[PDB]
Amino acid sequence: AKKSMIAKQQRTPKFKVQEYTRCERCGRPHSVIRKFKLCRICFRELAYKGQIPGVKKASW
Amino acid sequence: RIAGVDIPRDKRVVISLTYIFGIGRTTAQQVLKEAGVSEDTRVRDLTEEELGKIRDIIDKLKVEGDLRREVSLNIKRLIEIGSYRGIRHRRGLPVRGQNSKNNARTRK
Amino acid sequence: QYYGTGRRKSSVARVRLVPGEGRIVVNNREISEHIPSAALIEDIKQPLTLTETAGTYDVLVNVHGGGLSGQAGAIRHGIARALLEADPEYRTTLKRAGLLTRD
Amino acid sequence: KGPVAKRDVLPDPIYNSKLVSRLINKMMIDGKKGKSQTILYKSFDIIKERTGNDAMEVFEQALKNIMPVLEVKARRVGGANYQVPVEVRPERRTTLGLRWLVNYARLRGEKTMEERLANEILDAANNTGAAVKKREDTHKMAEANKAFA
Amino acid sequence: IRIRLKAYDHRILDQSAEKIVETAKRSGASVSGPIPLPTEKSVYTILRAVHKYKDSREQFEMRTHKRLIDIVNPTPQTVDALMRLDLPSGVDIEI
Amino acid sequence: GQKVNPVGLRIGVIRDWESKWYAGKDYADFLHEDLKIREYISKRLSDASVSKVEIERAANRVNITIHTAKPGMVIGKGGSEVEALRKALNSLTGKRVHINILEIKRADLDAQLVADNIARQLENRVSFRRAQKQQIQRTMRAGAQGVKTMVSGRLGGADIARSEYYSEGTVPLHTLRADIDYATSEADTTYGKLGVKVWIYRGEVL
Amino acid sequence: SLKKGPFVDGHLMTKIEKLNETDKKQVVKTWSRRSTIFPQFIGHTIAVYDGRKHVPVFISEDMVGHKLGEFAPTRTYK
RNA sequence: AGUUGGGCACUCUAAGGUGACUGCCGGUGACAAACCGGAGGAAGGUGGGGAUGACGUCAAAUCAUCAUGCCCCUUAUGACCUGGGCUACACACGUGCUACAAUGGACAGAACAAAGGGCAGCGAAACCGCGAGGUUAAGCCAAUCCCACAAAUCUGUUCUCAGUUCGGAUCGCAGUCUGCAACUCGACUGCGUGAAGCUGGAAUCGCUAGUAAUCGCGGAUCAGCAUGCCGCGGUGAAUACGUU
């Protein structure tokens, strides 16, 4: 029951306030970031393998 | 004196009026500024004129006279007609609205 | 105009020692006007008392960042640095009392 | 492991002394050292005013009257729970004195702390403060179990 | 004529800065060296686990390096040279 | 809770980014577009043994570099492949896309290529006990100071799974200067799904 | 809706108007628990859907300053 | 009013370098390895902190991130919509916040920060409102403008531990914002009430230094919601006898 809810989110609802965010890769709520639009797991995995040009490992 | 049992023993005029049902801190100052007692005095150390002015100013306000009845009247108004809020009020439950699986235990 | 840098606890102090009577200025203010709790003051004065510099130099300081304690620390560090730049003869006196560690 | 040492502000603007600064460091609730400094200065002023004596001598006498010479540690000899007296080092004596002073001063109960500290210091200098009573109690405890040493 | 160059890594920004400075100076731009500008970094603290173990996390860092370059003399030859500069994408020139 | 991906750790220090562009107000859009492009090109050239693909945005222009290890197949007749690729990429993105190809010498040293070869072999029903050592020897003969392979999942034994390890030489994953290429591959078989993790140590930089 | 004026659904308003235009009728089934109670709603018996069923309620004087859901509990506690 | 004229000293900023590495001296020592102290030095004995978590155990957690073999439903265990519910509450238990008080209550004046975000976004300033907040709107794609008026702290008035000028829970009324919509089910503000609590028993937890403790600030998620999570700064100590 993922692609159905994905199309739901894609379709404009009656009230604009109903709109929300999705990963657009796995289609998950719960901590999809706006800047990257990727979820937690996908974001980490992609940052690991070279992608996400600017981001690096943090330490200080 | 003012509206019933008085407390002029040792409390300043600003805080002495707080003991009355209907007067807080800000309202006390609002009354004393019209009375003109400088808000720095003790009630027992006052003149008959200032005391009369304060008593009249309080009489002009709803202080412990009709407040305790108006609150009960509104409670009955909002209880007698269903009013899930009023139902919680009657049953002895939080009325402003709070979860019941947790604190807000002050109602039973 | 003997200048000395001073830093402590996220604070920075620019101390310049000029020949005067001992008047200390902190951002165009006096010591007490900006630094209450005379404990810090006497702590700021420790480098000035270890050596004979009671009233032979006025102090104009510009401070920024940190807090009162860190500001006083940076102030005393800069004072020590400037006074060393003035006379390095007694560098051992200050080193024994600190002022050259930058905690 | 091995032992380690520590230091603090030695000087003091008023009543210049290492132990005075150590005490000022004590009674520092929530790191508010300025409040403790002000309270201690006010208490010393009250001590010097209420009595025509220098606060330094009264403070020293109170310290010497509160200094616990013998501590009593715990020694679990099986199901006995014996207590063995212990000789206190001067540093430990001073720390215990400051601790008891602060505790019994805050425990006295008055309008402000400075007054409590002044009263406690005056009583201790007279060998009558609550800290002196604690010293006596600890000494009695050490005496009772002096058979171990 | 304020060139705002911003990049993710100084390793690439340094070559671009040297090149622009050389191109501008050769004609008489009277350009000041690459002005170091404060960086701006954003952190992304993230849970390293999938479901449990909130205490386990991983922190990724956003680093951006930018430096300013100001040209005083008009010397339109410098503008012509600047117009024909081709550099990697990490510079994002902005006048 | 075990070792982290070395690639994710060496980045920002020695290893170079696989993507380079400063996104102004359109970072998410560029990211999703490049992700779609990578997925498309991967599922299209999976038969070509492609290792990695870097992309650069040149102000409405896209530059692509492909490390193939066998460009002859990726180019085919030359115009046919480049067209089928760039036309489709421009249609998907809507702007200009430029393509470049690079050959890989000693393809046995690329982590992704070796992982894909091992996944194919496993899907081809080849015994892991052979494939692992065979590929290890091939890589060692191709030039490498250290190599290690991993195979885990239902190897057809029983309802009890296991993971095998085979390696030789120095593989200091903790050394921050190793330039180790780590690649993971999946092999969907009749009994389930298998995972392969291969990290190769080629040498450090002074 | 605080300063925009009392809030009410359009369908419910139309139904109440068709009701009060001539005379009262049977109870009305409405799923709107958000709508307020206007002074013109007095005497109009309406059935609110509390999730389980439609519970009728009679409007009166003291029930103008509140909403419908106040008289339609959605959870049972004996 | 750092605004202006003038400069790139200093701070500061961001690139490349030096520096610290038991480097040297004394002593112990197997002469070595190694240890205590000392001098020079900003840094003395992996300097302070973070990432870096081996082979393997716990068939530990996740088919609900994704894929995934097998089994099962398939005009239905698949799919669309309104409302309710996920916020229940007789009782208990972890985590966190507020108090039980005069180191403080309330009021008045003064001062020190760091870090970070901002385009249908941040939104100065002005006007209005006892107030949450509303209208006009400059500036800002940013070391410029905003978020953003920091608090503890100092200096003054006052209260004297009275269940109190402590506590505000809870409650009635009257308003403000958000969004189709705030009763079930948000936040904030003003009036009035102010309940318990007067420091907490079994027992137990965290911390060897800019740590704890304490006081604020920003950020992600977000129309709207923070006592939750991450980060930053301000004030800032006591012990370490010794492994029974």
Swiss-Prot record, chain A:
* Details of cofactor binding: Binds 1 zinc ion per subunit.
BP term (GO), one: translation
Summarize the record's disruption phenotype note: Cannot be disrupted; as the protein decreases in cells 70S ribosome formation decreases rapidly, with concomitant loss of uS2, uS3 and YugI (general stress protein 13) proteins from the 30S subunit.
Q: Known InterPro entries for this protein?
A: Ribosomal_uS14 (IPR001209), Ribosomal_uS14_bact (IPR023053), Ribosomal_uS14_CS (IPR018271), Ribosomal_uS14_sf (IPR043140)
Binding positions for Zn(2+) per the UniProt entry: 23, 26, 39, 42
Q: Which Pfam families match?
A: Ribosomal_S14
GO cellular component terms, semicolon-separated: small ribosomal subunit
* Cofactor entry: Zn(2+)
Keyword terms of this UniProt record: Metal-binding, Ribonucleoprotein, Ribosomal protein, RNA-binding, rRNA-binding, Zinc
A GO molecular function held by the record: rRNA binding
Q: Which PANTHER family match?
A: 30S RIBOSOMAL PROTEIN S14, SMALL RIBOSOMAL SUBUNIT PROTEIN US14B
The family annotation for this protein states: Belongs to the universal ribosomal protein uS14 family. Zinc-binding uS14 subfamily.
Q: By its UniProt entry, which NCBIfam families does this protein fall under?
A: PRK08061.1
Q: What does this protein do?
A: Binds 16S rRNA, required for the assembly of 30S particles and may also be responsible for determining the conformation of the 16S rRNA at the A site. The major uS14 protein in the ribosome. Required for binding of uS2 and uS3 to the 30S subunit and for association of the 30S with the 50S subunit.
Q: HAMAP family of this UniProt entry?
A: Ribosomal_uS14_2_B
Assembly:
Part of the 30S ribosomal subunit. Contacts proteins S3 and S10.
Protein's name according to its UniProt entry:
Small ribosomal subunit protein uS14B
Lineage of this protein's species? Bacteria, Bacillati, Bacillota, Bacilli, Bacillales
Swiss-Prot record, chain B:
Cellular component terms per the entry's GO annotation: cytosol; small ribosomal subunit
How it assembles, according to the record, is: Part of the 30S ribosomal subunit. Forms a loose heterodimer with protein S19. Forms two bridges to the 50S subunit in the 70S ribosome.
Q: What is this protein called?
A: Small ribosomal subunit protein uS13
UniProt-listed PANTHER family: 30S RIBOSOMAL PROTEIN S13/40S RIBOSOMAL PROTEIN S18, SMALL RIBOSOMAL SUBUNIT PROTEIN US13M
Alphabetic keyword roster: Ribonucleoprotein, Ribosomal protein, RNA-binding, rRNA-binding, tRNA-binding
Described by its record, this protein's role is as follows: Located at the top of the head of the 30S subunit, it contacts several helices of the 16S rRNA. In the 70S ribosome it contacts the 23S rRNA (bridge B1a) and protein L5 of the 50S subunit (bridge B1b), connecting the 2 subunits; these bridges are implicated in subunit movement. Contacts the tRNAs in the A and P-sites.
The answer, when asked if Ribosomal protein is one of the entry's keywords, is yes
Q: Which HAMAP family match?
A: Ribosomal_uS13
Family from the record: Belongs to the universal ribosomal protein uS13 family.
**From which organism does this entry originate?**
Bacillus subtilis (strain 168)
Region (Disordered) residue spans: 91-108
Q: Which GO terms describe its biological process?
A: translation
For the keyword Cytoplasm, the answer is no
Q: Which GO terms describe its molecular function?
A: rRNA binding; structural constituent of ribosome; tRNA binding
Q: Which domain of life is it from?
A: Bacteria
UniProtKB/Swiss-Prot annotation, chain E:
Tell me which stretches of the chain form a coiled coil. Answer: none
UniProt cross-references to SUPFAM superfamilies, sorted A to Z: Ribosomal protein S10 (SSF54999)
Q: Which GO terms describe its biological process?
A: translation
**A Pfam family annotated for this UniProt entry:** Ribosomal_S10
The UniProt keyword set, sorted, is: Ribonucleoprotein, Ribosomal protein
| Gene3D superfamilies the record matches | Ribosomal protein S10 domain (3.30.70.600)
Q: Which family does it belong to?
A: Belongs to the universal ribosomal protein uS10 family.
For this protein, the record's NCBIfam families field holds:
PRK00596.1, rpsJ_bact
- Self-association state and partner proteins as the record states: Part of the 30S ribosomal subunit.
Can you name this protein?
A: Small ribosomal subunit protein uS10
Give the species: Bacillus subtilis (strain 168)
Tell me the name of the encoding gene.
Answer: rpsJ
Curated annotation (Swiss-Prot), chain G:
- Could you list this entry's UniProt keywords, alphabetically sorted: Ribonucleoprotein, Ribosomal protein, RNA-binding, rRNA-binding
One GO CC term, this protein: small ribosomal subunit
List, in alphabetical order, the GO biological process terms annotated in this UniProt record.
ribosomal small subunit assembly; translation
GO molecular function annotation: rRNA binding; structural constituent of ribosome
**Quaternary state and partners of this protein?**
Part of the 30S ribosomal subunit.
State the family named in the UniProt similarity comment for this chain.
Belongs to the universal ribosomal protein uS19 family.
Function, as annotated, reads:
Protein S19 forms a complex with S13 that binds strongly to the 16S ribosomal RNA.
- What name has this protein been given in UniProt? Small ribosomal subunit protein uS19
Biological source species: Bacillus subtilis (strain 168)
What lineage does UniProt assign to this protein's organism?
Bacteria, Bacillati, Bacillota, Bacilli, Bacillales
Quote the gene name from the UniProt entry.
rpsS
